[model samples]
Target: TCPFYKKIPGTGFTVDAFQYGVVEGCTAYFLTHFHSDHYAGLSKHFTFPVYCSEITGNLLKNKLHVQEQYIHPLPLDTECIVNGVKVVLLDANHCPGAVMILFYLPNGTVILHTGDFRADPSMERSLLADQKVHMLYLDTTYCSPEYTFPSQQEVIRFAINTAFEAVTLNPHALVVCGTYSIGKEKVFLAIADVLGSKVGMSQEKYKTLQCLNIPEINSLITTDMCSSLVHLLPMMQINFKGLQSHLKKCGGKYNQILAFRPTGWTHSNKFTRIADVIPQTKGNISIYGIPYSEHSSYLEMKRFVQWLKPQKIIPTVNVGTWKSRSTMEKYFREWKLEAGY
Candidate 1:
């Protein structure tokens, strides 16, 4: 019975009801992914049965712990009828359980809603075959030319190389790198592979890694498991001021200790001051900025939109942000009238 699409406040919904579908009379709602932004308004307003991929459900149960009573889970690539609309869950490749939802109405109108996603060649090969999409809602976080992100493999290589360089420069110094606990757990594992038996992790990271079920790189040690590496404990304790006196008493016997924290040192003005004191006070501390990101780049976003060929394209998250918005509008504009309002 809704007469017009009143731009949903912050969302770009500006059009008269075009007979595409009914609103209050609709039977179901479908979720493309579980990211905060995409699912923000749902849990509060619409409790009417929600649908998502099985993998996404599992991740939600494990990570977010959403109960089963509210969710109707379906497997990837399977088509299901909801409110007379056929919905298919497609691989998004942004995170472990991310997905793109494809909606097909009885009138033959197809809409593909892409949640946050990245361009993995593997994902492209898995999805782009034998499927046609009419309209696409894309994640255009990095659609600007100024935003550049290297491949995952490139990031892994950079972290490994940097860790190795730290080992060579100061065998007795402790090397610590801050990274995310759940998502980028692989970065820590990659660093472990580079350091071999020489590296150690914090107890929190050790427990988090266990949740991920990764095979332990034999040489790496966590703080709980550092009894075997007692010889290097002195060098590792220097970063903590309280341990400085204890390390001094050890008299350079244990030269190097490597550790990482969950908090990054970049957000403070004191970072440089702390970096300056590391070598003189703590043996030798090295910092390395490797290429790492979880979002899609400009070219990848464009390719995804091109593949879907949606009747209309809408973006979220960085929509009005000057740096990325203009660039995204430019790219979306190139798609002819289908992309314009």
Candidate 2:
């Protein structure tokens, strides 16, 4: 999540400004990803040049129906000069089309706008290594100690094991995983491949999956909801009633409902195992809120900040309240100092 509108200091670029109407003196608008919260205000009529990763550009035209002439898709990791500012797109690891925008201002100021990211080890080996960043715009969604959770890969393995175990226990089990249109596809895709069950999703969602350009994904996808034991549903549709309603609508195709709601908010402690956290079971409906978050955990955020050691840190999320922002900044200051900045 970012501010409703953000203007990069010392530049004419406004980032993620689809909802802010016309920003004065803005040379271009940059979108980080296709998430609704990030790309909320984008429309066909909005008239500023939009810059993002090529995959994101494809999504903009197909998903949002933005014009080709107005959209500028920059190659990842390649430096591109836009209106005198040197810009590079780094993979965010948040979603498929997500990217972290790095801008080298003509005035010698280096800024990294991490537009909602998860700290992966691969980033340390990438362009961010040894880079002296003046300003870092961070994703502080899980900035508190209580928000700590395991790595995404760990949670992905857990989802696969849990879903597989459920299937082994009951061959007639109907497994449904809650996810956004563009995120958490990996978990379900893994389960589908491992369990040999065709993945079920709405026709529209299948189109979004196709946009990802994963050739193997098509072999596992089935538009016929009844043909697959594992289904992908929107996050909001993973509740008890919704699960029960879905099973009822299936007309006896499934006997039990096993749901996995993958998110970071479900995790509250670092020491606790993901399976033990928020395990709910009632009758034939079982819901597990696994820690399969795209956002970085508290420790992951600390590691990222310490490694970057930017001259200044600007949080992008949980800034609506002064207290929240202050609390996050306290950690940032402590980490930066620990990094010998």
Candidate 3:
């Protein structure tokens, strides 16, 4: 019930959390991924060891340059002990090293914390599938009914098709897409397969991918912008000023530039929320916003919730308890009552 770490009802032990106990130090810390938003306030040096996936640990040790002594690499599906608590890390399926943490207290109470994960059925079939969980901390990113968009696979298909359309509609237009560093690489990877061309990205993303050492994604990077028909960049760079700078650099060989962002904010339920899709052109520059995202849509959330059936749900982000109420509104209903013939 406290804002940060959840104290197992009677065990008096704290389950490590996102930002909580990061700087000042706690008995332990659990970092889900290297996403800036996920590890918002983490300091360079921790008073205590932080547990994370092997890839995330490498990113911290090599890229972010935290000392190797501090990062404890928690392998997926491996069970271990921390202090007196028995712990296990499960694949979150969000980023390369993101994980969902489950542990049993000395009291034998089971606690599950889903760290920024997309709900998948296979994960639901794990050891906890039938076992009763004492507490569950959920990632309710798309916890409202208005977010009925397709899954990540479908979104990738939509993005590949849209990328093709943008190229077909605007000849000599260098396609610029907006995406986060890690989560949306699939969109670019799929684009490369479909277009038979490499998508160029900024040096920052290039360095991160360099660490993966995976042969399949090795050739995705490109050095020259002029020769590349497609360019991938962070979301902030696609705004008017950013696009203007790139357009000047590309010269007249490309008359216009088209930018697309694949994120859930596009179809968020509230006003002032981003619009569902955008297909607009001004002067020589054109922009298209797509609903492709990494988080689970409302329908997907419903299915996951129905399967887990936790008594209480807690949201990781600051989007608030209103979403929790909205999610419970329909999921709490008995399914057999639907009376579908």
Q: Please, what is the whole-model Cα lDDT of each candidate in the order they appear? A: 0.52, 0.83, 0.68
Tens-digit per-residue lDDT, 15-75, candidate 3: 4444554433246666778888666545566556767888888787767667777788876
Candidate 2 backbone collisions, by pair: 18-41
Better of 2 and 3 by lDDT: 2
On lDDT, the leading prediction is: 2
User: Model 1, poorest ten-residue lDDT window?
Assistant: 9-18
User: After best superposition, candidate 2 residue 297: deviation in angstroms?
Assistant: 1.4
Give the alpha carbon lDDT tens digit for every residue of 72-150 in model 1: 7877777677655566777776655567666665666666666667765565566445566565666766666555555
The prediction achieving the highest TM-score against the true structure is 2
Candidate 2 structure quality by residue, lDDT tens digits, 1-341 = 33432779888897777776777778888999888977988877766799988888888888788899999988898878999888989999898989999989888889999998998767888888856899888898889888867777778788788878888989998989887768777888888887888899898888788777676776879899988988988889899888888898899878898888876565255567766655688899999877677889788888888877788887888889889988987887788667788
- Clash pairs detected, candidate 3: none
lDDT (Cα) of model 1: 0.52
Q: Predictions ranked by lDDT, top down?
A: 2, 3, 1
Candidate 2 ranges beyond 4 A from true positions: 1-5, 267-271, 275-278
State how far residue 215 of model 3 sits from its true place (Å): 4.5
Q: What TM-score would candidate 1 get against the native?
A: 0.64
